[PDB]
């Protein structure tokens with residue numbers, strides 16, 4: 001964690017001409033804390049080394065796709081420096097004014113506004129997924145089969161003395177079932193947002209139109225279907241019906257596939273909670289995942 005004195009000092013070092021008048025905490029994620037500075041900029045500071053690589057990733061991707069997208073995205077204006085601890089010490093982005101398009105907010109909109117929102121997200125995704133990926137930096141590729149095998153290995157290392165025989169057999173089976181299913185690894189890899197959820201979609205209540213996409217730190221080259229299944233959850237997201245509208249504008253050509261990927265992903269969450277948990281020292285996510293795994 002950081003003091004305001006630390007943030008200001010960090011920025012002053014690299015941007016001595018930049019006058020800081022105001023600084024307040026803007027937000028906080030698992031990877032970075034955000035500061036709003038002079039009410040003009042969002043500055044992200046990594047909470048840890050791992051978070052710093054997401055920050056570093058966001059900056060590189062945003063630089064590459066700048067003015068290629070049909071909706072406003074953060075623009076990099078300030079960058080920090082690498083250390084032995086952080087790949088990037090901080091970054092300052094233009095602030096995009098607006099509020100998040102919550103499930104609540106969306107469902108209260110004129111049926112036309114909802115439909116237009118679905119159209120704007122579709123064409124945003126269409127152009128993003130169309131961006132030319134050759135000449136893209138290292139690390140950017142996220143091969144799904146590589147991910148699952150690596151995860152499987154991790155679950156095995158973590159849970160071998162935590163599960164009983166029948167319970168681990170269930171784990172093996174699930175991972176077996178995933179890996180022997182071609183549709184998961186068959187996609188054309190494209191540049192994807194990879195955390196495309198309602199809290200990263202900023203909305204203009206005056207125009208009743210989406211006015212920005214934020215938080216590219218998870219972006220990668222992978223399965224573009226990821227950017228639909230993330231919006232499709234019923235608890236914290238928009239739901240299968242609204243995403244379906246988005247799918248039509250996208251001109252999507254295998255929607256049951258999208259659906260099959262959604263359901264697999266929802267089941268898979270227990271395992272991510274174990275892994276993401278253990279890695280981020282979230283003993284709460286680990287125990288939840290562990291308890292879920294010891295069940296249905």
Ligand SMILES: NC[C@H]1O[C@H](O[C@H]2[C@H](O)[C@@H](O[C@H]3O[C@H](CO)[C@@H](O)[C@H](N)[C@H]3O)[C@H](N)C[C@@H]2N)[C@H](O)[C@@H](O)[C@@H]1O
Pocket residue numbers: 029030195197199218233235236237266269272276
């Ligand atoms: N909270 C409970 C929910 O958790 C996940 O969904 C949420 C994601 O976790 C969020 O993203 C954060 O966590 C990810 C790792 O999980 C990170 O990669 C990402 N950078 C983070 O911003 C995203 N913004 C919203 C989405 N609804 C599960 O899928 C969902 O079933 C479950 O109900």
Ligand SMILES: O=c1c(O)c(-c2ccc(O)c(O)c2)oc2cc(O)cc(O)c12
Pocket residue numbers: 027034042073074075093094095096097098099100214215216
């Ligand atoms: O410009 C930004 C902005 O406005 C918001 C934002 C976030 C949550 C809110 O509830 C809100 O009202 C605004 O955050 C961002 C996060 C970024 O990574 C980059 C940005 O540029 C902004």
Ligand SMILES: [Cl-]
Pocket residue numbers: 014015016017018
């Ligand atoms: Cl300067």
